[PDB]
């Protein structure tokens, strides 16, 4: 189960939820359109506060309770609504791609298992009959030793829906149109894939291709290699294993649902490239 806390409990925690950036000497580690997030200190231990609606406050308390796993985020409580969870002390894959605030690129090998920890974090949602709705860099944390944990299971489903949600940039074409398949899961692990192989955002209007899920199309048209868009900020990358996850995120983005890997062949093609 999870700790209920009281509101000024976790206001104080916060220092009055004090909206300042941490870098200014507040508390904001950030902003969604759901709510802001804010470091806290819970008897020394450092913990991540969430105050945002209501459903997705639920559905991610419901999910939290029935899935625990190496490699997704652990909610620690629940308080005006307020979520507690284990603080990541490196932040969001999003963040250290772009090496945000400047901490140092990540290795290939790095990279080689926060994909592994991704495709078994998402393994055992899938195992547990659960589509996250959301799978993009930014909901993939790390931890002390950068081990992956897949955040925010707000969105997630335990078929057809009005209320279209997600990612643009990372969204499958039958998410786009509606569907809710655990296949839609597959297709924005595949765009993650090309950001850890790149190091480039999924979006930039300031580039050809906008999308980069499109430097699939540019590859198999000859125009591009794999080889053009590998990150330069790492000097340990060999041609074998960055083609073979290359490979694995090209399979995930094929745009008949159906002709997609399941999670277990994407976790065991993730494997055998190590
Ligand atoms: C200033 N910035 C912004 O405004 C946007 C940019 C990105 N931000 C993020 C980094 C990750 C952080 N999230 C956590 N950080 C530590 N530990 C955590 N445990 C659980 C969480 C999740 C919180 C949401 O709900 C799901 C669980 C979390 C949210 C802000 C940093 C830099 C940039």
Request: glycine share 6%.
């Amino acid at each position: 189960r999870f700790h209920s806390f009281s509101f000024y409990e976790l206001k104080n925690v916060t220092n009055n939820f004090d909206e300042r950036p941490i870098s200014v000497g507040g508390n904001k580690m950030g902003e969604g359109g759901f709510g802001v997030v804010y470091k806290g200190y819970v008897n020394n231990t450092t913990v991540a506060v969430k105050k945002l609606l209501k459903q997705q406050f639920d559905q991610e308390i419901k999910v939290m309770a029935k899935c625990q796993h190496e490699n997704l985020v652990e909610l620690l409580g629940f308080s005006d609504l307020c979520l507690v969870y284990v603080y990541m002390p490196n932040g969001s894959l999003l963040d250290r791609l772009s090496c945000l605030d400047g901490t140092p690129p990540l290795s290939w090998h790095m990279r080689c298992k926060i994909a592994q920890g991704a495709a078994n974090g998402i393994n055992f949602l899938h195992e547990n009959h659960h589509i996250h709705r959301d799978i993009k860099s930014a909901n993939i944390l790390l931890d002390e030793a950068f081990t992956a944990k897949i955040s925010d299971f707000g969105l997630a489903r335990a078929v057809m829906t009005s209320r279209i949600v997600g990612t643009t940039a990372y969204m499958a074409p039958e998410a786009l149109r509606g569907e809710i398949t655990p296949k839609s899961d597959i297709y924005s692990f595949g765009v993650v894939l090309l950001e850890i192989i790149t190091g480039l955002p999924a979006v930039d209007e300031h580039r050809e291709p906008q999308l980069l899920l499109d430097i699939k199309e540019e590859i198999e048209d000859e125009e591009k290699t794999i080889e053009d868009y590998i990150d330069k900020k790492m000097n340990d990358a060999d041609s074998t294993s960055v083609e073979a996850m290359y490979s694995v995120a090209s399979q995930c983005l094929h745009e008949k649902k159906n002709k997609r890997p399941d999670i277990k062949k994407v976790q065991q093609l993730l494997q055998e490239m190590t």
